[PDB]
Amino acid sequence: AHALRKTRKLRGHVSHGHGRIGKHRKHPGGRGNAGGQHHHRINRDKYHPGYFGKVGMRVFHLNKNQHYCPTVNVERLWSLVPQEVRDKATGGKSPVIDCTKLGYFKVLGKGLLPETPLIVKARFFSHEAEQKIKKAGGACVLVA
Amino acid sequence: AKLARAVQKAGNENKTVVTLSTVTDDARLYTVPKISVAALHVTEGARARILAAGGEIITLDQLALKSPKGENTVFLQGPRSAREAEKHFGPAPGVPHSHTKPYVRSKGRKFERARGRRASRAYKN
Amino acid sequence: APRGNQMLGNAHFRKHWHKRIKTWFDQPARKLRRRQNRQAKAVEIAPRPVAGLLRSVVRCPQKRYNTKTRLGRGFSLQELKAAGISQAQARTIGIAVDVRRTNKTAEGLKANADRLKEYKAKLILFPKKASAPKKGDSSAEELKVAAQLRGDVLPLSHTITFDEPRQVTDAERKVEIFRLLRKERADKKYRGKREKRAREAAEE
RNA sequence: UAGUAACGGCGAGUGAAACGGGAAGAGCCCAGCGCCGAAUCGAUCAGUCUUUGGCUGCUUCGAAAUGUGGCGUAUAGGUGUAAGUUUCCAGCAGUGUCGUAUGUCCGAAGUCCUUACGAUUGAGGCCAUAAACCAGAGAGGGUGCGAGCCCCGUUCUGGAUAGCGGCACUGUUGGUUCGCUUGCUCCUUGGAGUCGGGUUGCUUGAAAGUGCAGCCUAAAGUGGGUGAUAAACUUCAUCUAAGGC
RNA sequence: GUGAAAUCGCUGGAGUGGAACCGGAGACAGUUGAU
RNA sequence: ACGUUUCCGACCCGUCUUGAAACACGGAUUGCGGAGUGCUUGUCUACUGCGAGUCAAAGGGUGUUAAAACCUUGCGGCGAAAUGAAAGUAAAGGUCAGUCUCGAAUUGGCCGACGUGGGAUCUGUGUGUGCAGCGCACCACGGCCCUGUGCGUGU
RNA sequence: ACCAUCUAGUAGCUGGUUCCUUCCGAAGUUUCCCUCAGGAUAGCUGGAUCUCAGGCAGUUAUAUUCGGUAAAGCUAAUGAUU
RNA sequence: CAACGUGAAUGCGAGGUCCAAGUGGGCCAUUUUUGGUAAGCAGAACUGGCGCUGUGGGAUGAACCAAACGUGGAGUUAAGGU
RNA sequence: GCCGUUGCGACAAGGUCGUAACGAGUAGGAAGGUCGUGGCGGUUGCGUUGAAGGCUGAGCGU
RNA sequence: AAAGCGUGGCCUAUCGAUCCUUUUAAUCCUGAUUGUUUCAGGUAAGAGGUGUCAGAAAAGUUACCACAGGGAUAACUGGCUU
């Protein structure tokens, strides 16, 4: 939208909104993130603390698929149960949730669980998740 | 959930909840009471649950006729400061006692975590 | 000269990038060309399936994907033997053979054997000479319903089923899942140290 | 995947891959071992054909035992045996079936009345309720700026014709086929100044060396390589380098 | 084809003492409107 | 009104500069051309759609006013969980009552996203104003929960 | 040397940077920088607005405090000095 | 929890967040003040100005005295004058 | 007296009107522009009885 | 004896980032085909030093000289001072 840009309203004013003293001039401070330790030090330290230096172990060819471990909280478990399965879960029968098929590998215990006990099948459980599920009356089943 | 909490308070059972924010569905909410809500936009899930629980959804023009002066209303809105952008507002990240979120390309040990963030490298604010 | 709170720039444009530019204005043209190539191939090889050879079922390699199956390169020789199909015969009746893959598990072998069996059930074989049929060749009125198949041969279904609700058993509840997981981790982590201790104890 | 792992006066900057979803999909041949062992091949001569090249030989020469050909290559392979099962190439002529950025030929309807103009294609009218007429053609160009209807053209998932092709079937000609699969049986099975190592230089995201090369050193045979932090000693897993399409 | 500005020539009017131009306010000349 | 004549005012523009009419620089005249753009990546703001989701890629299917439009995703991007170098671990308490080996214990109900102060509005009730109640957003002061780490125990 | 290309080489430096009205309206100061013709940083400035409907003020009064300059002193310490 | 009820003058609505420009050569004056014999010299403090600003006056002038500006009119004046 | 800005207000209106105060400005920032230019998707019309372009009287708008 | 006092010097100066090296610390974490031991890499705290002290690795000459600028800056005139 060139019609709405500042250049449209700056026609006729000599400096184009860049001043008569300072002037718009190429690269007056350097190119890129240069000088982060000498003359841009205040900006770098104020807005990007921790920038310079190096910390931690270094992994040659990290394997991200090993550490891939999506998680789900116990408070979201019931929403994963489809309505038809909820209808079928009657007479003490608890719905069975296979988190691996839904894409979650670990179950974390944040929030509260519904009245209906649930059977939860996941590769990993947190201690609080296990305690809350069992206290609500369901069971935790470990799958490979 | 906020609508449900508002209506479940002593005296608010039969009041009309007025909000100009979008009403979204909460997966963590298990029981939905009877809610009478006047709103601009209500998502499909929230609308279905409210109507299933015996509630009613009206528009602002309909509220103008029901309560022209705003009688028996409960005015609500969403959390205005609960935005990702707001987390980046405040004192600069590199200032003492500042918990502002920096603008980092990525998250990891190699991304602004060494000098000025731990006493092992120069200092820590 | 960055000013104020900004994300530090990262644009990789310091090379003479103007000499290596690739646009995608020919995307619909490529789509049309590939459709026309498929049509020409279908005309050429009718009534054989346009897709071509039949591919095998395969589990995705890593544990991030091992709960999903997909089309493989071909059928292993063990699977062909289990289905009673010669490799030479498979090449003729249009079944892909993966000469590198071998089966180490009965379930994986059986899935592909069943796939081969259903493909053979669905196969229609024309007589080698139209005048004189032979044994194995499909029957006359079977050869009339023959139609070219489009898309993958025996496409895979990716629908997700939900286990039926059941009763929570008492033995299930009495298990200590977190303690079990931590015990397994500890046992794997300390396996070697305990072996060293056992060897030293034996030597003493 | 990902501006990620990693590299970098760890500064400025640089920077992949596997898994995953797709397009397309096609597999094979040697050396060596072993068997037949010259069963192989080039020129030339003479016949013969559909001759810008092919087929036949007591033609004559030559290549080839320092080994041409046949079987055979990691999925192995071979011997014998029992079951099953058993052709394939190339041209020629026809019969149809179908494409052609292939030539040539062919096409619906006003130059109607009035008016305007230097010149109309401009303006108005052309039975009829719905009406000048054609329209599967109202793309484009030309014609005295303006045109579906004046012309070339345009539409007919256009026709006719000749030529090129691709197919499918018939006949014919020449060559060729003791084979192929599965079980059992016994036998058998592989690339060296290369790999690897030291050092030097370049190169890479490749980090106690990713790739390449010089010089020195220089292998082995369940050996060799690889598993991304170097080394011994151990669990294994996975391929088979130094030949080719 | 059209045929701008700068620059230039003619005819008529008017000004013209070491710049010329310009803003404000009238006058003159002139232009224009008046059921 | 770009004619003449009078009265008053009246230094040449652009630019750098503390300061330009300057004995500072560019400018003889006229026409035409002539300078904050493209793209990648960020961030904020405004608007639109949907909303714990959203957008879907390459691709595929169909489309002959066919580079369009229309349909189409176990899978991918961002978001829904953080924290540590890493191994890894990973976010529910409030209140009332008990037992007690009176403790860095234990049990059970009820409630369930914490407490207090201020809070537009809303509700009740007096008389523009007051009092009382429920309190959005937000602010202030605290409390708990997850993770890393120092101290420090035991059951 | 010359010719073409890399090459529109880079320039903290010089020059230019094209319509009209309306409203608001500065700075030449602090800190760091091989920094001193330049930057980053705070300040000064504009815009978007949002939450509310009495606590503020380049001014006084009351109360209470801080100071060692003008004046004063050296017939009070220090230092001169008739 | 109970009660008490706004406790100097004058003026006046108050607070919050975000995004960003230009600037980072200054100069002058009353008063104070350092270097210098002095300087239209160099360096500081408070305030006001010029820069960015025209207007009446000082014959003329960035800063002096008066006074700050939409566009017109009547009246009255400031500094300055007759 | 008139123009505009700002604040407030009335009116069934992206508008009109009322009212009080106000109006300096470089660098710079915003707003409005039935100010101007060239395309595109649409819409409204004019044209050899004379378009674009060019020269220049009566007006309109700060 | 106690109340008490003591985290260096009665107070105001006496000093040092990133990267790398090195040391001390845990009966610590990692080397991703399974383990053991070396070796290497990490987490925490010090030291090795940048005196241009917010921290480049650095000798001259040009009268053979060049470019971008500067009246921010010297040499001649003019100005203030004497």
Ligand SMILES: C[C@@H]1C[C@@H]([C@H](O)CC2CC(=O)NC(=O)C2)C(=O)[C@@H](C)C1
């Ligand atoms: C501690 C001190 C400094 C250190 C070293 O030289 C400093 C580094 C700093 C840097 O970031 N890059 C470098 O190339 C040098 C060193 O070995 C000695 C002189 C002593």
